[PDB]
Symmetry: D2
Subunit: 250 residues, 4 copies
């Protein structure tokens, strides 16, 4: 019987690649999404055409609010409902935009989105994952540049730092239950086609290893390693997949 | 004219020692507090008896909420109202209790622990900066054990990690305004007055340097250094004041 | 044809597991050793019995000295002589013993051995490896998860391991233009020997959150195999703990 | 009676600033030097002019070798010979130059100088400082580097040496705590550019620094040393204070 995985923010880009790779590895998957309904449903349809009854979608807003714990429990619940088990949680969903210290979004909203998606939802999901329980593990999508942050991204950066601490705290606390908790920390990865070519080049030429971005598949490869039988003594580790970017001085 | 400082959670213990030392160095102080109203008022009284109208109190819950931004803005405003300037912000107030992964609701624990330890500091930092011989700085009370966290303290530890991220982000972003942003990271300092001495001795015995906890004053001494003219090129630094505790293996 | 790897200190324990797993993966291997000659030769015999002409031995002391650069050059050269290429270098050899700061090897001999094996030799091997340079070239350095919470009285060992973190990052940056990746694997507690008592072993095992046991040599080797593989082609400068959570545990 | 300090590499630049501040704060000082004998004796003269019999020079090569442990012991012994005590050690001496991995000095020499000055000598100085101990505020301050995790291209040996020094700072803080000896570091970013250096190269470095687009002064580095040795840092051990104007926070 096939294990099952929840991948948050899995309708497109890096989360989608992670879902695809877990599916190719033999996992059944819950494709969580927020706004990307068509892409999510299309992805589930493709995966089920490949192997029947192996993919479902699950919609949720992961912005912080008083109902977020119930939304996070329901995501985990949805994996048990479809597949009867939940072996892997990948916390990939993430809001990302600048919040200068000095658009129509209120600061209350920025806090809720940036800290909710990057940190609090990962925490609540982790809680519900553990509570609802083989090679069980969680993989948090972190950020290789967390200690050399981009200008004006304080709330996003706080979120991702929080996620490091969660990865560590949950690894320690969940180890007695046989649940491993690790991270993958991308540097520059899968720049959107629509992003300006000059801006894409500016970022790509920062990367010592090949002067290029990571593919989504390269990021997925590190997730696949961490959930695998070859990582069974690894917990609390965060693997940078950054081409050396984080090592480069100003 | 004398400089002014805001100290959050300044009624008792470490926040009080910081307030007192800043006042002894010649600062006017805002004594922020939440529940410890008697202690906050009598402290301000003691300081004002020493030098007339050099201390004021300002009450506010720093739990995350829709009204938290306005609260933080009003704390910085009270400094300007009292003293016409705000040179130093010390983010010391902090909720601290366990939140195991397996009567407060979790969404309330999220609000209190992430609010006090991270989101209020961010909002105070915004309000501080927006209001801007000059020697402006922020000191954030961090935690030397943030990478070796206590069992069952996920939310607290996430909060403190987010606080390291804020320290670094804001140091980078506010540097052009001449505002320095640093941290002080205690390990074991004052233990609860209610905690039995024999239990206190179990924390104390872990500390390499003298097998005892830090005084409030020892913590305050690092804060005084960082706000001083002797630290004018120091920004984004977090100084452990931990007696070596963070270096001690399991 | 098959890629080739050098593994230092490969006769026993973790080094041997790394060599075996690389060989299983399709690599030809140079088994470097210092004193463990019988085990090195026995290992080469076993691997060659699986596939002919895929394992050789190279003896060298990796203590720091005036002759270490040449020794390191010869270790790399042993791989080219045998196999005609050198794709992977694994810096695993390591001296390990206490060097109390406050008081019969002389201190200069302890410096030589501990800094030599853990840091200078890996630097010199890295130089010789790079100088000899589609392909998938990489270096994996065996680091230590407890490098920031070091054991009492192990200053020189700990200095050597910190210096190795430095080399890992410095070499990642500098060799990236050549497509040579440089990474680390950081064990916590692994394969405790008979030379240790039950109290002492239980003391260490019991600290580990994930199962209250040491890592097997194979588990350390698994992380090495990943870093060397095509699945880690964008990874350089990364150090992967394989420590069961040990490093996260406060005092 | 005044406490005494050893400052390695103290004839000029940052080491001098440290020795001076220590002296002014009331320390008697051993000014260690390797090649800058004229600069060392001249500083000892100024300081002795301020207060008689409160400074001496001490020459030593801190390159790794089999006699380095004796050289380090003699530096400490020299503080006790002159002053009867040794309360503070500042490990500041440092060789600094590139050592490319892919192709002057032999590599054996590069290793000896860069690992010797930046790491092994500090270890041996620390051992001798501790061993020789017989109110008190004993400490050691190691001059580290804020950019140790974002190394400059082709500086692998120098970087290894500074990383080792981090490890020593931590290890020795742990092991010497029971003797009341605190061990800390100061990690400069960009500090005191040689007048030698070209206008354009100085500018490239200055422009990197978020806090005022300027390098640190020697005095600014020395201020952080003085803090760590002071009674205001009595519970601090094993800490490394960056003094870098935010340089280490700036991404590529
Ligand atoms: N260079 C990089 O791209 C890079 C660098 C460092 C780290 N990372 C990390 O790697 C992961 C994947 O990166 P990416 O570039 O693929 O991310 P992305 O395109 O920015 O977003 C991933 C998903 O997050 C979901 N999300 C956003 N806000 C949400 C909300 N309020 N509630 C629920 N879900 C929400 C979105 O779902 P819908 O589309 O369904 O709305 C989106 O598809 C992220 O955790 C990211 O931080 C990426
Ligand atoms: N003590 C230690 O060993 C230790 C160790 C590591 C880090 N630290 C850090 O050092 C700082 C001081 O430590 P401490 O032990 O003195 O702190 P504490 O006594 O636990 O808390 C300090 C103050 O935080 C304020 N506070 C708590 N919840 C609040 C809320 N919801 N809204 C507004 N204010 C709130 C309280 O104000 P009222 O009393 O007025 O309600 C309290 O007096 C903290 O940031 C702490 O995390 C301390
Ligand atoms: N075991 C652990 O728990 C642990 C924890 C943290 C890190 N590590 C790291 O993981 C790696 C493997 O650990 P391990 O326990 O397998 O190592 P180990 O048994 O202590 O030693 C590995 C090998 O190093 C070689 N070596 C020692 N001194 C040498 C010298 N002067 N010149 C050349 N080679 C020398 C020895 O070769 P000969 O036998 O041929 O003489 C020995 O087989 C090491 O780098 C270690 O530091 C291990
Ligand atoms: N300058 C910066 O931007 C910067 C940045 C990061 C860290 N740092 C650190 O801060 C400290 C001081 O910086 P600096 O720029 O003032 O240093 P520096 O000018 O490069 O040299 C300091 C001293 O080290 C001594 N030294 C060099 N090789 C030696 C040897 N073989 N034996 C004994 N002594 C030797 C020299 O003594 P003689 O002159 O007597 O030969 C020299 O005076 C160093 O530890 C350095 O790495 C500096
Ligand atoms: N959620 C998220 N998205 C990101 N991106 C969305 C498309 C441009 C990159 C980045 C980039 C660094 N951290 C990120 N986190
Ligand atoms: N790791 C990372 N990448 C980033 N980018 C790479 C793709 C576009 C921006 C940004 C941007 C703000 N913080 C970031 N952190
Ligand atoms: N806000 C806060 N209080 C704390 N304490 C108050 C009662 C004794 C400990 C600690 C301890 C570690 N981090 C802390 N943070
Ligand atoms: N070279 C080496 N050997 C080690 N060991 C050999 C006997 C069991 C532990 C350890 C342990 C931590 N780092 C180590 N490094
Ligand atoms: N010993 C030393 N000297 C340095 N310098 C001497 C003259 C130019 C900078 C630097 C610079 C970074 N680390 C350093 N270490
Ligand atoms: N902090 C720092 N500064 C540096 N420099 C300062 C001006 C000359 C070089 C270098 C050079 C190699 N590593 C360095 N680290």
């Amino acid at each position: 019987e096939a294990p099952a995985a929840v991948v948050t923010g899995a309708a497109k880009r890096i989360g989608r690649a992670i879902a695809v790779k877990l599916h190719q590895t033999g996992y059944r998957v819950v494709i969580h999404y927020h706004n990307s309904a068509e892409a999510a449903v299309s992805l589930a349809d493709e995966l089920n055409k490949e192997r029947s009854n192996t993919a479902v979608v699950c919609q949720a807003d992961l912005t912080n609010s008083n109902v977020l714990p119930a939304s996070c429990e329901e995501i985990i619940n949805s994996c048990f409902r479809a597949f009867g088990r939940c072996d892997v949680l990948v916390n990939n969903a993430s809001a990302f935009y600048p919040t200068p210290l000095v658009n129509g979004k209120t600061v209350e909203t920025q806090v809720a989105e940036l800290i909710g998606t990057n940190a609090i939802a990962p925490f609540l999901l982790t809680m519900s994952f553990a509570q609802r329980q083989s090679n069980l593990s969680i993989v948090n999508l972190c950020d290789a540049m967390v200690d050399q942050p981009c200008m004006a991204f304080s709330l996003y950066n706080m979120g991702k730092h929080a996620l490091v601490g969660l990865t560590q705290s949950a690894a320690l606390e969940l180890a007695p239950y046989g649940i491993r908790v690790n991270g993958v920390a991308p540097g520059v990865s899968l720049l959107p086609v629509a992003m300006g070519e000059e801006e894409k080049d500016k970022w790509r030429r920062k990367v010592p290893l090949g002067r290029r971005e990571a593919s989504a598949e390269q990021i997925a490869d590190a997730v696949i390693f961490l959930v695998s039988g070859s990582a069974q003594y690894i917990t609390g580790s965060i693997i940078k997949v950054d081409g050396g970017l984080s090592l480069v001085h100003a």
